[PDB]
Design an enzyme around this catalytic site. Structure first.
Site, PDB file in Angstrom:
ATOM      1  N   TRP A  49       0.835  -1.192   0.000  1.00 35.45           N
ATOM      2  CA  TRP A  49       0.000   0.000   0.000  1.00 35.45           C
ATOM      3  C   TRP A  49       0.879   1.256   0.000  1.00 35.45           C
ATOM      4  O   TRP A  49       0.435   2.330   0.426  1.00 35.45           O
ATOM      5  CB  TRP A  49      -0.894  -0.013   1.249  1.00 35.45           C
ATOM      6  CG  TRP A  49      -1.872  -1.151   1.245  1.00 35.45           C
ATOM      7  CD1 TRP A  49      -3.193  -1.079   0.908  1.00 35.45           C
ATOM      8  CD2 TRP A  49      -1.610  -2.544   1.548  1.00 35.45           C
ATOM      9  NE1 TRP A  49      -3.775  -2.327   1.000  1.00 35.45           N
ATOM     10  CE2 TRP A  49      -2.830  -3.240   1.391  1.00 35.45           C
ATOM     11  CE3 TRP A  49      -0.474  -3.258   1.962  1.00 35.45           C
ATOM     12  CZ2 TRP A  49      -2.949  -4.625   1.605  1.00 35.45           C
ATOM     13  CZ3 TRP A  49      -0.592  -4.643   2.174  1.00 35.45           C
ATOM     14  CH2 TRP A  49      -1.828  -5.302   2.001  1.00 35.45           C
TER      15      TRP A  49
ATOM     16  N   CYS B 233      -6.428  -5.526  -1.647  1.00 35.10           N
ATOM     17  CA  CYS B 233      -7.634  -6.340  -1.428  1.00 35.10           C
ATOM     18  C   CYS B 233      -8.348  -6.868  -2.710  1.00 35.10           C
ATOM     19  O   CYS B 233      -8.581  -8.082  -2.832  1.00 35.10           O
ATOM     20  CB  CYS B 233      -8.575  -5.600  -0.452  1.00 35.10           C
ATOM     21  SG  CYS B 233      -9.318  -4.063  -1.182  1.00 35.10           S
TER      22      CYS B 233
ATOM     23  N   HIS C 222     -13.195  -2.572   1.474  1.00 37.74           N
ATOM     24  CA  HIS C 222     -12.390  -3.779   1.456  1.00 37.74           C
ATOM     25  C   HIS C 222     -13.197  -4.811   0.675  1.00 37.74           C
ATOM     26  O   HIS C 222     -14.428  -4.747   0.637  1.00 37.74           O
ATOM     27  CB  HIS C 222     -12.061  -4.235   2.891  1.00 37.74           C
ATOM     28  CG  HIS C 222     -11.334  -5.547   2.979  1.00 37.74           C
ATOM     29  ND1 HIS C 222     -10.338  -5.912   2.099  1.00 37.74           N
ATOM     30  CD2 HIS C 222     -11.447  -6.572   3.861  1.00 37.74           C
ATOM     31  CE1 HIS C 222      -9.889  -7.112   2.417  1.00 37.74           C
ATOM     32  NE2 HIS C 222     -10.537  -7.531   3.488  1.00 37.74           N
TER      33      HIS C 222
ATOM     34  N   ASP D  11     -11.240 -14.758   2.843  1.00 44.02           N
ATOM     35  CA  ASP D  11     -10.498 -13.523   2.613  1.00 44.02           C
ATOM     36  C   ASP D  11      -9.020 -13.836   2.597  1.00 44.02           C
ATOM     37  O   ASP D  11      -8.461 -14.270   3.611  1.00 44.02           O
ATOM     38  CB  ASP D  11     -10.799 -12.557   3.767  1.00 44.02           C
ATOM     39  CG  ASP D  11     -10.263 -11.151   3.529  1.00 44.02           C
ATOM     40  OD1 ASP D  11      -9.500 -10.918   2.563  1.00 44.02           O
ATOM     41  OD2 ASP D  11     -10.659 -10.259   4.306  1.00 44.02           O
TER      42      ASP D  11
ATOM     43  N   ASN E 143     -19.602  -4.814  11.188  1.00 44.05           N
ATOM     44  CA  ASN E 143     -20.526  -4.230  12.159  1.00 44.05           C
ATOM     45  C   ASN E 143     -19.994  -3.873  13.553  1.00 44.05           C
ATOM     46  O   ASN E 143     -20.767  -3.778  14.500  1.00 44.05           O
ATOM     47  CB  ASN E 143     -21.810  -5.076  12.292  1.00 44.05           C
ATOM     48  CG  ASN E 143     -22.972  -4.242  12.816  1.00 44.05           C
ATOM     49  OD1 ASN E 143     -23.117  -3.084  12.420  1.00 44.05           O
ATOM     50  ND2 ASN E 143     -23.755  -4.790  13.746  1.00 44.05           N
TER      51      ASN E 143
ATOM     52  N   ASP F 165     -18.814  -1.481  16.539  1.00 40.11           N
ATOM     53  CA  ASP F 165     -19.060  -0.103  16.943  1.00 40.11           C
ATOM     54  C   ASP F 165     -17.726   0.634  17.036  1.00 40.11           C
ATOM     55  O   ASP F 165     -16.680   0.006  17.193  1.00 40.11           O
ATOM     56  CB  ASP F 165     -19.708  -0.036  18.334  1.00 40.11           C
ATOM     57  CG  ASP F 165     -21.182  -0.421  18.334  1.00 40.11           C
ATOM     58  OD1 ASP F 165     -21.823  -0.420  17.259  1.00 40.11           O
ATOM     59  OD2 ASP F 165     -21.697  -0.702  19.441  1.00 40.11           O
TER      60      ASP F 165
ATOM     61  N   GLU G 295     -29.263  -1.088  10.500  1.00 41.19           N
ATOM     62  CA  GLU G 295     -28.906  -0.113  11.520  1.00 41.19           C
ATOM     63  C   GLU G 295     -30.170   0.529  12.094  1.00 41.19           C
ATOM     64  O   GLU G 295     -31.094   0.863  11.350  1.00 41.19           O
ATOM     65  CB  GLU G 295     -27.972   0.960  10.939  1.00 41.19           C
ATOM     66  CG  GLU G 295     -26.658   0.401  10.317  1.00 41.19           C
ATOM     67  CD  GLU G 295     -25.695  -0.141  11.363  1.00 41.19           C
ATOM     68  OE1 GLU G 295     -25.822   0.213  12.547  1.00 41.19           O
ATOM     69  OE2 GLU G 295     -24.806  -0.915  11.009  1.00 41.19           O
TER      70      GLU G 295
ATOM     71  N   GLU H 194     -30.272  -5.525  15.342  1.00 41.91           N
ATOM     72  CA  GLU H 194     -28.885  -5.185  15.051  1.00 41.91           C
ATOM     73  C   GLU H 194     -28.092  -5.066  16.354  1.00 41.91           C
ATOM     74  O   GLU H 194     -26.950  -5.515  16.428  1.00 41.91           O
ATOM     75  CB  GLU H 194     -28.797  -3.904  14.213  1.00 41.91           C
ATOM     76  CG  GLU H 194     -27.403  -3.596  13.686  1.00 41.91           C
ATOM     77  CD  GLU H 194     -26.669  -2.582  14.534  1.00 41.91           C
ATOM     78  OE1 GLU H 194     -27.257  -2.060  15.499  1.00 41.91           O
ATOM     79  OE2 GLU H 194     -25.500  -2.285  14.232  1.00 41.91           O
TER      80      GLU H 194
ATOM     81  N   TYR I  70     -32.261 -29.609   3.547  1.00 45.88           N
ATOM     82  CA  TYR I  70     -31.889 -30.729   4.421  1.00 45.88           C
ATOM     83  C   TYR I  70     -30.377 -30.806   4.682  1.00 45.88           C
ATOM     84  O   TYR I  70     -29.951 -31.206   5.761  1.00 45.88           O
ATOM     85  CB  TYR I  70     -32.431 -32.086   3.920  1.00 45.88           C
ATOM     86  CG  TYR I  70     -31.654 -32.711   2.798  1.00 45.88           C
ATOM     87  CD1 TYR I  70     -30.691 -33.691   3.047  1.00 45.88           C
ATOM     88  CD2 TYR I  70     -31.882 -32.332   1.476  1.00 45.88           C
ATOM     89  CE1 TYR I  70     -29.965 -34.266   2.007  1.00 45.88           C
ATOM     90  CE2 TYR I  70     -31.156 -32.908   0.417  1.00 45.88           C
ATOM     91  CZ  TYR I  70     -30.204 -33.866   0.692  1.00 45.88           C
ATOM     92  OH  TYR I  70     -29.492 -34.430  -0.354  1.00 45.88           O
TER      93      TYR I  70
HETATM   94 CA   LIG Z   1     -23.758  -1.009  13.328  1.00 41.76          CA
END
Ligand SMILES: [Ca+2]
Ligand SMILES: [Ca+2]
Ligand SMILES: [Ca+2]
Lengths: 8, 695
Positions: free
Chosen positions: B265, B300, B359, B382, B422, B424, B469, B474, B530
């Protein structure tokens, strides 16, 4: 291309 | 020693004598092979029907668990009374039958479901045409083929012949394959499409980059096998797409293992190709194979492009997803720890976590026999190095469904992927003691997208990774994820669940404490194939309940037939997630369970000779499976060749009671026909029976 952004 | 190289090979004896064979033995009595034909041309039925006609390889390529034709010419006609032979497929330097790397293929009267065997389907002069069927769990790689003729003196085997080497790949078309994908349009996009589009840029200025996966180009399939050899990946595991994808996630990056691409990078890219100059995977992979060293450089989307090639080439359905504002958690606590100096500015020294403009990683499609049912389907993998997983830079497979509900305890690397989409933001002041200053719950994972089927458009898949959100689910799923990393017990049971009827989901809370608590919870009810692949969420509710001290409380949730009946399929199960937070203590109780609906039987029998033009009596039998009276029961009989469609009505069927309906039919279309019965009443509806009949 990908880059680290500053915190908002 | 480990049998970890497809490229290596042992030398199988051509004259494999046993014991002390007398001089002057005459092997002339036994068959020898004069010729083997694989019908391997790209226009012929093997490659066409196996969806391998696109590869620029002139060897036979087939997919596992599906039959293909070959022809063996012998020195004289094969005679089963006197002759015995088998085909052999062999891989690696140290093949063993109990490892799946020496595979004997017996010549059988009838192919057996799921089993290696070859059936003779035609004989002309000295030739036999065989239909060979491979196991749907077969190792994926390049096999050597031999024909072995058995004699009283030992085995007589064909010589090494590179021209009959046979590649066996994953089979998205085979219903018994771990990578089975039941939708032709999706198989075409995620397996057969050799070009794509990768989204990048900013959330409100979305850019698209074309990418040539080139999985069918000359040399690429061979390079993918080379990649696994370079990983020293045991051959016995290469039929397992969990293992193959996890190996691919390590090997596509250079770290640890001399893998394909070196990440950079630095805006300079000394002595290599800048990441943004590449337009596809082929040059990178071919250079890796030829130089036998990592390729400089990628970021990426380049890792994702090459990994996508690797997956599709081997036959594991795959796609590339882009996450905008992608979190990078450095200390595995599933939140962005932002340390802020006293001045209020961000402490760049203490702050280690980071967030990326975007990403890109891969999803690979597979069952997850190692996880409970419900967690198959798309698995996040990934190859961009970010964090170590068990000693190496790799990531996944993580079940996207597990990630969505915060069940990040399920392998592999689900907590990291959860934080990517996700976590915080937690703004912290480190003092000379640590003070939390603010929490941002919506910054990370603003949008997740992948290329649409059938066009270059964007498909929003954010909802597959996370609840919306601002929705209570969530938060509950995040708190569940943090948990997996009050004296209240929670359990649930699905009570007497019969296919075709409403049923109750019963959630129980036991409060053994002397406190009153309040609960905030959600329920998610899902249909699952199944094999444990998820299909759809058919019901989702949030609820609040108050829990008195020293008490047990049941919360009955009604699930109506109309909510699930439109989305069922054969042998599907139901998958339930209940997550409850005890509000005062922030304690989280999370369970997931699956259940099979009880299936009421309708039995069809026939009485009388089944010959087109004469009468036969069809007897439809139905037993009431409930402890309740069925009312206004309509039974239907359908049979496109056998009967004009007919109905019988029963005003009332008592509990556990049986009814029979005799219907006289006269078939008008001979051969393999079929009878289908249906029952609907006021309460229990759309239960079926069926019977294949030969007219
Ligand atoms: Ca969130
Ligand atoms: Ca690596
Ligand atoms: Ca962190």
């Amino acid at each position: 291309x990908x880059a680290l952004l500053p915190w908002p | 020693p480990p049998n970890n190289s497809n490229a290596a090979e042992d030398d199988l004896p051509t004259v494999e004598l046993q014991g002390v064979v007398p001089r002057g033995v005459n092997l002339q009595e036994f068959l020898n092979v004069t010729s083997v034909h694989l019908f391997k041309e790209r226009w012929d039925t093997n490659k066409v029907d196996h969806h391998t006609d696109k590869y620029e390889n002139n060897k036979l390529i087939v997919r596992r668990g599906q039959s293909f034709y070959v022809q063996i010419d012998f020195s004289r006609p094969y005679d089963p009374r006197r002759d015995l032979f088998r085909v052999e497929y062999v891989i690696g330097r140290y093949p063993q039958e109990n490892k799946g790397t020496y595979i004997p293929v017996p010549i059988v009267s009838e192919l057996q479901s799921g089993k290696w065997g070859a059936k003779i389907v035609m004989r002309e002069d000295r030739s036999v045409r065989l239909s060979i069927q491979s196991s749907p769990k077969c190792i994926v790689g390049k096999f050597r083929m031999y024909v072995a003729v058995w004699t009283p003196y030992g085995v007589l085997r064909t010589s090494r012949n590179p021209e009959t080497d046979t590649y066996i790949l994953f089979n998205p078309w085979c219903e018994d394959d771990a990578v089975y994908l039941d939708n032709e349009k999706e198989r075409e996009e995620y397996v057969l499409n050799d070009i794509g589009v990768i989204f990048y840029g900013e959330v409100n200025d979305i850019k698209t980059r074309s990418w040539s996966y080139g999985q069918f180009e000359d040399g690429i399939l061979d390079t993918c096998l080379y990649v696994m050899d370079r990983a020293q990946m045991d051959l016995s595991g290469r039929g397992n797409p969990i293992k193959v994808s996890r190996v691919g996630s390590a090997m596509v990056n250079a770290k640890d293992d001399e893998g394909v691409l070196v990440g950079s990078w630095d805006n300079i890219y000394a002595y290599g190709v800048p990441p943004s100059a590449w337009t596809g995977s082929v040059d990178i992979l071919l250079e890796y194979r030829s130089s036998e060293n990592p390729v400089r450089y990628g970021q990426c989307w380049v890792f994702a492009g090459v990994f996508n090639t690797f997956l599709r080439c081997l036959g594991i359905p795959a796609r590339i997803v882009t996450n905008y504002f992608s979190a990078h958690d450095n200390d595995a606590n599933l939140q962005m720890d932002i340390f802020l100096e006293e001045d209020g500015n961000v402490n760049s020294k203490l702050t280690k976590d980071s967030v990326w403009n975007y990403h890109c990683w891969n999803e690979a499609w597979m069952t997850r026999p190692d996880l409970p049912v419900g967690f198959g389907g798309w698995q996040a993998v990934d190859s961009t190095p970010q964090e170590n997983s068990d000693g190496m830079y790799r990531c996944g497979p993580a079940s996207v469904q597990a990630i969505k509900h915060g069940h990040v305890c399920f392998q592999f690397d689900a907590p990291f992927v959860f934080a990517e989409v996700n976590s915080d933001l937690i703004y912290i002041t480190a003092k000379k003691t640590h003070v939390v200053e603010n929490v941002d719950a919506t910054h990370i994972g603003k949008l997740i997208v992948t290329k649409q089927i059938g066009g270059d458009g964007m498909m929003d898949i954010t909802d597959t990774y996370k609840f919306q959100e601002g929705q209570e689910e969530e938060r509950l799923a995040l708190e569940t994820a943090l948990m997996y990393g009050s004296n209240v017990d929670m359990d649930f049971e699905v009570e007497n669940a019969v296919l075709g009827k409403d049923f109750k989901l019963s959630i129980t809370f036991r409060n053994n404490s002397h406190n009153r608590y309040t609960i905030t919870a959600y329920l998610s009810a899902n249909i699952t194939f199944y094999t444990g692949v998820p299909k759809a969420e058919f019901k989702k509710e949030t609820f609040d309940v108050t829990l008195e001290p020293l008490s047990f409380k049941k919360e009955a949730v009604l699930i109506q037939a109309g909510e699930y009946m439109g989305q069922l399929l054969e042998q599907a199960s139901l998958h339930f997630f209940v997550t409850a937070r005890i509000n005062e203590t922030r304690d989280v109780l999370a369970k997931q369970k699956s259940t099979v609906l009880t299936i009421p039987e309708i039995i069809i029998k026939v009485r009388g000779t089944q010959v087109v033009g004469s009468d036969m009596t069809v007897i439809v039998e139905f037993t009431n499976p409930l402890k309740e009276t069925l009312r206004n029961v309509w039974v239907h009989l359908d049979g496109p060749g056998v009967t004009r469609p007919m109905k019988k009505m029963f005003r009332e069927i008592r509990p556990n009671s049986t009814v029979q309906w005799e219907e006289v039919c006269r078939p008008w279309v001979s051969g393999h026909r079929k009878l289908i019965a249906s029952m609907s009443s006021d309460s229990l509806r759309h239960v079926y029976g069926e019977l294949d009949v030969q007219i």
